[PDB]
Amino acid sequence: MFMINVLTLIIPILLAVAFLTLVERKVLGYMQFRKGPNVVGPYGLLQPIADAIKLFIKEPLRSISMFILAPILALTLALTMWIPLPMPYPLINMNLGVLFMLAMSSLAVYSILWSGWASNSKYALIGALRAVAQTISYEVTLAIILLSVLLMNGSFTLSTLIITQEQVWLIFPAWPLAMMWFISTLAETNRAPFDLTAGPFALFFMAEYANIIMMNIFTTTLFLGAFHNPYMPELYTINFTIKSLLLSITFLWIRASYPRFRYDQLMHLLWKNFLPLTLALCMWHVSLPILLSSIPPQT
Amino acid sequence: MNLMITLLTNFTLATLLVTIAFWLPQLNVYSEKPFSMKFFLVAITFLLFDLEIALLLPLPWASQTTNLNTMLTMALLLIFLLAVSLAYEWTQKGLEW
Amino acid sequence: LLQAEKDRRVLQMLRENLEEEATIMKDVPGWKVGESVFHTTRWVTPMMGELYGLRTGEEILSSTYGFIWYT
Amino acid sequence: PFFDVQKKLGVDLDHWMTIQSAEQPHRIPARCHAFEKEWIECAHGIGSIRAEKECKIEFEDFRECLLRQKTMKRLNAIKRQRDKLIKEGKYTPPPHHSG
Amino acid sequence: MSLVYMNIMMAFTVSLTGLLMYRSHLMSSLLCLEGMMLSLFILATLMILNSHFTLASMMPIILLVFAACEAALGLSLLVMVSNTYGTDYVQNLNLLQC
Amino acid sequence: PGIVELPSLEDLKVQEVKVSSSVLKAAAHHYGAQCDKPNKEFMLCRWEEKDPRRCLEEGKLVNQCALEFFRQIKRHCAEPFTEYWTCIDYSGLQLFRRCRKEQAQFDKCVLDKL
Amino acid sequence: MWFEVLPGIAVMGVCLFIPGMATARIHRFSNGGREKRVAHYSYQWYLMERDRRVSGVNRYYVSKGLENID
Amino acid sequence: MMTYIVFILSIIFVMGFVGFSSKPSPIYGGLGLIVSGGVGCGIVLNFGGSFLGLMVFLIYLGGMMVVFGYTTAMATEQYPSNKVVLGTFITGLLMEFLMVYYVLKDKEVEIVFKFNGMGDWVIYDTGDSGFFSEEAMGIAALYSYGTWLVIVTGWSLLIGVVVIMEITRGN
Amino acid sequence: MNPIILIIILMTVMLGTIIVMISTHWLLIWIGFEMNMLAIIPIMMKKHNPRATEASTKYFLTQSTASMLLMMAIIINLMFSGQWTVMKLFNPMASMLMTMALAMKLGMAPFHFWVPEVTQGIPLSSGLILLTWQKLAPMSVLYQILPSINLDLILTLSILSITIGGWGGLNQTQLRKIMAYSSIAHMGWMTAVLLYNPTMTLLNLIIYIIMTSTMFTLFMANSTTTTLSLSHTWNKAPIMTILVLITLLSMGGLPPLSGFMPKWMIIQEMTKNDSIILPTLMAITALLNLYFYMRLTYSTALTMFPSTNNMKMKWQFPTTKRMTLLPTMTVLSTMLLPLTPILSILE
Amino acid sequence: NVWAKEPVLVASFAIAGLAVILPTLSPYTKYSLMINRATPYNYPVPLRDDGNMPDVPSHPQDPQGPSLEWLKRL
């Protein structure tokens, strides 16, 4: 039954990412004055399916072992990185899972650098080196902010987190920390306004958008949600899914609106605006439970 | 070993996706035809802040002990030293463009 | 209560193991039958090979490595 | 040299990382705790060479508690005798799944 | 002697010989030094976890963060070597002859 | 070298308290309350002499006190004790804050009848 | 209007709803209806091993309630 | 798929160390060392291992190989094999197969030691009532006990930062 | 750089060697060695030539592999009898690796290949501080761990260090390589006694440190790196000649002068055992390593080399240098013959 | 002043200064110490009776020893 659990996880990742692409394209269309796409079939579903098919039948051409090894790592992260996400009963009860999130984000940085090395000595690989540098400049911020938002939760176990979110949401004790972390999720997804940047393009594209859905599900679990009532977990599943959907639409909706940074403005902004503010909010979150006598039950 | 089974299934299915991406089209039709310094400062900067993150991050497991004063003292000392390193490169105009 | 159960169970494993060792080494030179290799005759805690020997796979996997990768 | 600001200020800043059998934070033991306690109580006011001469038994006992060497030797010998007598065929073993 | 320790120390020795003999570059030598670092980390970690050596469990994490900043220093030095030349060969280092 | 002392199954046969996890966990406060006055004799035996193969008598004694405890709770109230531990049973790792109504019912049971 | 973007949202939300429902039903379906005993600590694993030992079925969830009192 | 799963992962660990200590091109060496770090993480998590092994995996794989491949890609080229590299791989593979031969076909292997090569479930605890970990309160020291050590550690890292900027053109 | 930054970095070199001195633990000793490395790198490459770049590269590789081999020896020590105390070890193999790691750390003749090459292409302050503190740091550890060492290692490294530090230099004219070969020879003398009475080893360490400070201070009296510059120091000032004369002859080890006192007392507490072949071999090679001293003396102190004008131009200007503490260390390091019973000051 | 120059820096140093100083004013750090000390993990050991103590209550129900009552009273 355990391989059946694995198949019920990683068969809807294909449908999830493909229908995510139609959802984001339709949503951008209605953000503008566009009905795109609706002509190709009933409300545009066979258009992403058959378009994925056409992308698989492109017949491209060509170091070969490196070109093999990069997108296989990207998509095996995209598969193996929905394991401890506690849609009510998670797949593996990891004692620590958030540090596993950080480690596999670093593996995504490996993937980008291997693709840039496989790109065979190009001004594109210099740009991809810069993209590796900007992507690696974010796991400091994400780990430190994640450390502070678990500090009010005691353990790394994330079931304790779903215990903590019953009374009020955790968005209220840490809202600006959450704001900086959500900007870091925009940062880690390598999309707008944080840009730029051959095949197999379907597998690489799949890796990026499964990484997006992972970051949005983890955002939804980390800060808000509903209550885990046993012997009817589907209620929590539905409410969690609705909130994660609204957050992902908001995520693409913020992508729909602003021009993208300058690279040096991005570094300048990152260090000289997030990084002291992270440290200051984090030391305040350290000294907070000793001044409220509320340290969480680290069991 | 359950997670090893998951890793094995995901790795094998992803390799089958890559081989569907490559060795599928049977229609074999027609075969045809300097670096900078400021890139390097960012990596070592990340590296040293990551090391001090590794020093910081076992903080919440430690939160259940008696010596609270020394804990709060050395914790504030660690974040203060990290911010002092940041302010040192900030005031010595290091990471600038 | 669980502690007393554990003590009865480990003494049961040691008794079974020494009886089966007395059988299994019945015609070998040397081999005193009850060798505490430690000179100080005290209670020493066994090392899961003294407990979970001669089992062939199943229960030693569920016992030695059961918690370590359960789920 | 061996300077002793360590003793002149009298601060145990280093005397907790040092051995086993000190005050672990939640008061849990190591694997060979009593062996270290007996070997150190054998070797306290002892001049580091008669420590070799006259704390031999408990030091060997502590070493074979730490590594557990001769016990694994005896275990390997018993398993190889098991292999040769199951090659012989005498008593297809009722150690497993019986008493 | 817990036979995983055998081939861990063997692979340590092979990593050390990789640090010693090298014919073209220096980054590969520093990378084999990092592998030797990993070997020390793994051996100490398996021992402290075996012995229930719960009090001084600082050793593997502190060992790796320190030898990590050692490797960072080595990277800065190799960048300075490669910046005062075009490459980072073992050759073109024979100046200051003896 | 020195021979070992393993007392055989002559003294190593007492009928176990063969109940499961959740019932034993949910019965814990009353188990430590009324009985487990002489098991601290057993624990003091165990910590004053760290050599099990010594404290077998008081291990037998705490086993039979547990058996008598469950007999006493079986003959009297409650049968909804079974309802209480099957209420607390299926809740994963057992949060005691899940099942509260039948905790109150079992409280009134044990206080009135015994 | 955006009445038409709602079927794509609904179908992709069905695709998000399915793995948690399948996982929860498989846990409640292949463990005798009892929830799968989450275990993080060696205490709880020892308790679970003696639980699956005393049941005799070699399944920890059978739970053998209040019968071996005699 | 047997008892010796820790031993097999140790064999693949030695394979990875020989794979980059056979002196390849340094980005292939970084690939092999990523493989080595992953399987060493597997070994330490087999000993459990829950905290520290996957912990420093972030620092080792999550912080070092990225910077090594970064500097390796940007500095020099080796842009498009030799018998010495594959010969070192031959000798490492042969000594590995010789160790497998003498472990599995004999009693013990002694270089200058006494290795009892058998089922390494030994040594292990008899399921005590730990209820946290060893690693939990282990690394949850350094704060109620670690006065001196983390002070000199952070001080050394701050000096490391100022050393790096000086070498790479302080100020 | 900044002077405050140099205050901090030299403070950390002090702190690292003190942590090596002070702890009963092994981890703090390894951290002290590493911090010593990390802080002694930027003292080198104080100028901006690729000479110091390659020197810092060689120093970092040898220094790093020595530290890693030391950590290997400590983890082997805890594979055997397990504690982090700085005392007698419990393995011939771990002590073997530990003495080899400390031999790469300070410099013995199998491992001396990096020392002249790193001491040539560096400024003089960097060379002085690396020689004094990098020979001061491991001798504390050796003093502490001495009762577990097989004598074949220390004896072989000592004999070979004295003879290779003698035989090198006779072709060499660069003064930094001369002084580095002298460092190898005196470290061999400092090593060959440690299994007999270590008080002599730490006394020879004090004497050699004071002599090296006087030597490099009189090489910092003006900017000189070769012998012909020392001939110009002859014709520009007379007192520097006789001071270089007396410090060179005290490095030679002659009885009415202070540098003989570490040699002879070592011979004494050697030969209260039945070691005779070892003192006569060590002392014949101590006769051998005086020849390059003596040809430097013959070059620029007692013969009179022809000089070059613009020394006429240099005659108008005062020696406005700074000396850290020159005359105190000089006359304390030369006239210290009748204070041989200040041996027992070291307990 | 500097409130327009680098305002996030000013807010950072402000919350940092209060995070440093603010533990000097608390009626709650003693509550933190009592909570984090009085949580039992290991086994509460027994001991020999005949020290003749007017303490160490022989019954866990017996409140003769030092205990907690401010817990349930918040």
Author numbering:
A (entry chain D1): 1 to 62, 67 to 201, 217 to 318
B (entry chain D3): 1 to 33, 50 to 113
C (entry chain AM): 73 to 143
D (entry chain S5): 1 to 99
E (entry chain 4L): 1 to 98
F (entry chain A8): 1 to 114
G (entry chain A1): 1 to 70
H (entry chain D6): 1 to 80, 85 to 175
The authors write:
The ETC is composed of four large membrane protein complexes: (1) a H+-pumping NADH-coenzyme Q (CoQ; ubiquinone) oxidoreductase (complex [C]I), (2) a succinate-CoQ oxidoreductase (CII), (3) an obligatorily dimeric H+-pumping CoQH2 (reduced CoQ; ubiquinol)-cytochrome c (cyt c) oxidoreductase (CIII2; cytochrome bc1 complex), and (4) a H+-pumping cyt c oxidase (CIV) responsible for O2 reduction. In mammalian heart mitochondria, the majority of CI is found in association with CIII2 and CIV (SC I+III2+IV; respirasome) or in association with CIII2 alone (SC I+III2). Here, we report the isolation of functional SC I+III2 from ovine heart mitochondria.
CI appeared more stable within the SC than previous preparations of isolated ovine CI (Fiedorczuk et al., 2016), allowing us to improve the model in some peripheral areas that were previously disordered. In contrast to the isolated ovine CI (Fiedorczuk et al., 2016), subunit NDUFA11 (B14.7), the traverse helix from ND5 subunit, and a few other peripheral areas of the complex were well ordered within the SC, confirming the stabilizing role of CIII2 on CI. When comparing the particles between the classes of the original 3D classifications of the SC, isolated CI and focus-revert-classify, it is clear that the closed state particles are distinct from all other classes.
